[PDB]
């Protein structure tokens, strides 16, 4: 035992470094080596209160603390805690400061006997926290209180009298914070902030109602530029933590707009423009503020975060202060991730704003515009691309005249994300000049960081262009092979060197998806071997890119790729079983893509995967139980394996028998695989607190029930898993699920509602009339949700009601109750979007009704006509999609009504207004009742339609032109990327037959159309 050797060196060494590090090692040894105990005890106490330098003082103290936890377990050294308490109230400030320090060290040991002393500590610290002599004493007291709070809560029932005491000490801890900042004590200002962060986690009885007021205080610190920056970062982090752990308290105070605008002002502060433009921390306040806005947008309603930011968009964007223009753009770009729906609806304001940024004189504003666009494209992919006509020339110019390496990167990075989602027929207009520019750039730039961005942009061209990329395919692969040499040799390659290789593998495989196997056949043998070389390499990033190549190959070659299973599945299983550890992000990414490749292979190599099912579910099941960041993906992949297995049993998507199975329509072998995954799915939603895992689970379950029917959730008349499912789903609707129980909501919470509503919409289509018994518990809640304060909640609910009605059809025994509710919405709701979704349900219910609805035709039609007339006024793509969906839904509803009871409807004014909104621009499913009505009206030789034949042909000209545009895309588009005009082949033929008769009649005006003349013959 060299324990005493350590303390003797700690006390008597000539070098303070020695005495210090001796005590550091003495602490470690106390546990292992602790008769003359009392000789060492007294020397330690003496040196603690007398050594000149606090650093050596603290050393002895910490040894004392571990020693004291040892003896209290033997219930020895009874004098320690009483002497320490005596010394804390001694008249010598230095004696008190050292006593409090030792007490904190004791509390840090977490010894159970300290629970016997809650009152002493509360009484003692209530004094010491106000010690006017020593700011260190007050800060140590604040720190000790965090441990005393935990102690009082370990008790089954928290003692009220204690918690009242603690709740009064909180205003004192704020006072210490003021002291530490006035005196410039940054070290203790941090320490106190940690005590405030720890209060967020406490029960409400201990804290009082102080949380909002703490946030209000942290904001006032954070916005004041006189304060040291490092102190302000502390303040912004504290608010950020409050949004995470205590958002309920923030909402009560409506502190969202305060938080947002506070962080918006902090983010408008001067920054290192030169470092911004070339560097490749988040300890400057302006940057921590953006992380605040980010968290705020993800936790609170867009009314709290986004509405303020967008209210301030006009003035900051035109300010003469470049950092304000830069700020509002970056603020938006961090907003889109948490509030993408809200952001998309502000595209009328935001897109012109990013266009303004691209035109700024100051490069820092230009880089903020670009980051904003990148962020827009990542989250709202297609929508941003539509504006390519203005973006592309502005972004290309920035590349040409770029003077800084980071501008070039983000210009290239924005071009990538645009091209990636630009529409097939639009990229063709541009394909040749961009390809020449992209390759011109790839030649010129030599830094791998830039070349990697150009390579991704070039691959994005392939993605958009699909077949249209074949002229460039060979030319491109020739150039790119230079980046994919010596794959196994990773030594001496920089992080970016691997990235330039990894991306080249990934985007060459995206070229194969674009130009399918026939044009890819030239390079399959070398590339597939290279990719397999990457899998065997030792860089997670490089193995990851190999898996990307495999997963894309699976798409291109299908079953032809089965011969490779034997070599690949072994490497995939190895990758997935890796340790994930701080956490190794490179491995996490590598595991995500390997799991994707596994799913893609099973779907592709249909029969051949069967021997791999048990192992793949075994490996994937394991990761669900034990993985850190792969549970959601791993579960999704288990369902992809089921999809592969069911597809191999020639169970066709959508062709299941409706209703509850008294037995099974899947062979016993496949049903075993379903049940295995179904139990794992149910277990990860029941009492699950991560709303990510619930959304993910509910989504997989909803898709798989839609594809393969109720067997996914129940078999052999045993509804045990179906009942558990509804309990959880209904729980989410009531707002009472584990993940909810930690009135405007966050888009994330909205999404949780929708996916639960979608569990019902999927079951109703799967059970039809057998659904009614399940639907009964949810029906009042969903109906209730139709009347919510939230327009978004109303819209989701009314839409789900409509889709439930469609699944139940004429076996709906609640049609009358549903119709009354949706008519109320159709009539009285103030949201056009809600009234539009209601119109769809109303027509469906009327179509399925077998009772008498003559009473409600006149009011419903008057409401419908009004919805049309306000949408006519509004006729900003966000409004245009709602306006256009209203046109389709309203016209669909009238049509369903005329087909149901043609004689209760006056066709004279109705048919004209209907024609006036055809052809549609969206929601072409509502063409189906309109087609059926045009078929009925002509066979009756109904005059109103027969005098209106010319517009009818013009409409079918467009209908048929779009169906052939769409058929072309189906063959040209990249493999794996609702545009249907006809909901069935039968209705298509019936429309065709009518087009012939129209030709027989009316002097053949149908054939006078190139488009229909082609279809008539």
């Amino acid at each position: 035992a060299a324990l005493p050797a350590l303390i003797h060196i700690l006390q008597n060494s000539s070098n303070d470094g020695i005495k210090q590090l001796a005590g550091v090692e003495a602490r470690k040894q106390v546990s292992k080596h602790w008769a003359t105990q009392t000789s060492v005890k007294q020397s330690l106490l003496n040196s603690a209160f007398n050594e000149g330098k606090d650093a050596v003082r603290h050393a002895n103290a910490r040894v004392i603390a571990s020693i004291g936890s040892e003896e209290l377990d033997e219930k020895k050294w009874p004098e320690l805690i009483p002497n320490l308490l005596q010394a804390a109230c001694d008249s010598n400030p230095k004696i008190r400061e050292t006593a409090i320090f030792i007490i904190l060290s004791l509390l840090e040991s977490f010894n159970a006997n300290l629970a016997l002393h809650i009152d002493d500590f509360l009484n003692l610290f209530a004094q010491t926290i106000n010690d006017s002599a020593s700011l260190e004493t007050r800060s140590l007291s604040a720190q000790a209180l965090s441990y005393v709070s935990s102690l009082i809560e370990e008790e089954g029932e928290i003692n009220p009298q204690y918690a009242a005491k603690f709740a009064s000490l909180i205003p004192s801890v704020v006072q210490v914070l003021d002291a530490t900042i006035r005196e410039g004590d940054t070290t203790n200002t941090k320490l106190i902030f940690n005590c405030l962060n720890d209060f967020l986690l406490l029960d409400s009885q201990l804290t009082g109602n102080t949380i909002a007021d703490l946030v209000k205080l942290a904001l006032q610190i954070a916005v004041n530029s006189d304060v040291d920056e490092d102190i302000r970062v502390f303040a912004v982090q504290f608010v950020t933590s409050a949004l995470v752990y205590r958002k309920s308290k923030i909402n009560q105070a409506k502190l969202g707009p305060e938080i947002t605008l506070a962080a918006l002002k902090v983010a408008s502060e001067e920054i290192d423009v030169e470092d911004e433009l070339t560097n490749e921390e988040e300890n400057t306040p302006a940057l921590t503020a953006l992380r605040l806005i980010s968290n705020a947008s993800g936790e609170l309603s867009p009314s709290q975060v986004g509405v303020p930011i967008i209210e301030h968009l006009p003035t900051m964007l035109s300010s003469s202060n470049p950092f304000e223009r830069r700020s509002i753009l970056l603020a938006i770009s961090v907003l889109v991730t948490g509030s993408p729906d809200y952001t998309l609806s502000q595209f009328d304001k935001i897109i012109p704003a990013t266009v303004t940024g691209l035109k700024d004189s100051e490069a820092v504003v230009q880089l903020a515009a670009l980051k904003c666009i990148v962020q827009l494209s990542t989250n709202l992919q297609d929508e941003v691309a539509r504006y390519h006509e203005q973006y592309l020339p502005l972004v290309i110019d920035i590349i040409d005249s770029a003077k800084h390496v980071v501008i070039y990167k983000y210009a290239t990075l924005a071009l990538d994300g645009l091209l990636e989602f630009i529409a097939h027929n639009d990229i063709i207009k541009y394909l040749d000049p961009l390809m020449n520019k992209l390759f011109q750039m790839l030649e010129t730039q030599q830094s791998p960081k830039l070349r990697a961005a150009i390579v991704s942009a070039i691959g994005s061209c392939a993605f958009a262009a699909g077949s249209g990329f074949v002229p460039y395919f060979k030319t491109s692969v020739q150039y790119l092979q230079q980046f994919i040499q010596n794959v196994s040799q990773i030594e001496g390659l920089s992080e970016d060197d691997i990235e330039l290789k990894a991306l080249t593998f990934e985007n060459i495989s995206t070229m194969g998806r674009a130009v399918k196997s026939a044009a890819f056949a030239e390079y399959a043998e070398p590339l597939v071997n290279a990719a397999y070389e990457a899998i065997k390499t030792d860089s997670a990033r490089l193995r990851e890119s190999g898996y990307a190549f495999i997963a894309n190959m699976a798409k291109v070659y299908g079953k032809d790729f089965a011969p490779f299973l034997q070599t690949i599945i072994p490497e995939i299983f190895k990758t997935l079983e890796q340790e994930e550890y701080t956490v190794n992000t490179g491995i996490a990414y590598e595991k995500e893509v390997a799991a994707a490749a596994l799913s893609e292979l099973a779907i592709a190599s249909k029969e051949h995967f069967l021997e791999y099912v048990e192992p793949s579910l075994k490996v994937l099941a394991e990761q669900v139980n034990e993985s850190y960041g792969l549970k959601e993906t791993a579960l999704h992949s288990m369902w992809a394996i089921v999809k592969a297995v069911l597809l191999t049993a020639n169970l066709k998507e959508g062709e299941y028998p409706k209703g509850v199975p008294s037995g099974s329509y899947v062979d016993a072998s496949a049903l075993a695989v379903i049940q295995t995954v179904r139990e794992v799915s149910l277990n990860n939603v029941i009492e699950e607190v991560e709303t990510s895992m619930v959304i993910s689970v509910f989504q997989d379950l909803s898709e798989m029930l839609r594809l393969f029917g109720p067997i996914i959730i129940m078999d052999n008349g045993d509804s045990t898993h179906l009942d558990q499912l509804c309990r959880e789903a209904l729980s989410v609707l009531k707002g009472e699920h584990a993940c909810q129980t930690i009135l405007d909501a966050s888009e994330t919470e909205a999404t949780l509602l929708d996916v639960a509503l979608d569990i019902y919409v999927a079951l109703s289509t799967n059970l039809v009339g057998g659904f009614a018994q399940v639907f009964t518990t949810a029906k009042p809640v969903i109906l209730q949700l139709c009347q919510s304060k939230s327009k978004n909640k109303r819209s989701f609910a009314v839409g789900a009601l409509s889709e439930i009605a469609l699944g139940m059809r004429d076996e709906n025994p609640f049609i009358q109750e549903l119709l009354e509710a949706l008519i109320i919405s159709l009539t009285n709701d103030k949201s056009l979007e809600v009234r539009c979704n209601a119109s769809y349900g109303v027509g469906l219910l009327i179509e399925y009704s077998s009772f008498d609805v003559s009473a409600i035709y006149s009011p419903v039609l008057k409401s419908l006509y009004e919805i049309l007339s306000v949408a006519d006024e509004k006729n900003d793509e966000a409004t245009k999609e709602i306006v256009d969906r209203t046109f389709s839904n309203v016209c669909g509803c009238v049509a369903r009504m005329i087909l149901k009871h043609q004689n209760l409807v006056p066709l004279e004014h109705t048919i004209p207004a209907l024609l006036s909104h055809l052809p549609f621009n969206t929601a072409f499913e509502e063409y189906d009742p309109i087609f059926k009505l045009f078929l009925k009206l002509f066979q009756e030789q109904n005059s109103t339609i027969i005098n209106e034949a010319p517009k009818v042909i013009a409409i079918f000209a467009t209908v048929f032109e779009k169906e052939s545009e769409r058929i072309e895309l189906e063959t040209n588009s990249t493999l794996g990327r609702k545009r249907k005009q006809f909901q069935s082949e039968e209705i298509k033929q019936q429309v065709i037959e009518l087009l012939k008769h129209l030709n027989q009649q009316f002097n053949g005006a149908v054939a006078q159309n190139p488009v229909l003349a082609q279809v008539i013959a």
Partner: peptide
């Protein structure tokens, strides 16, 4: 997932 990348 309707995008080119798999991560």
């Amino acid at each position: 997932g309707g995008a080119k990348r798999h991560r």
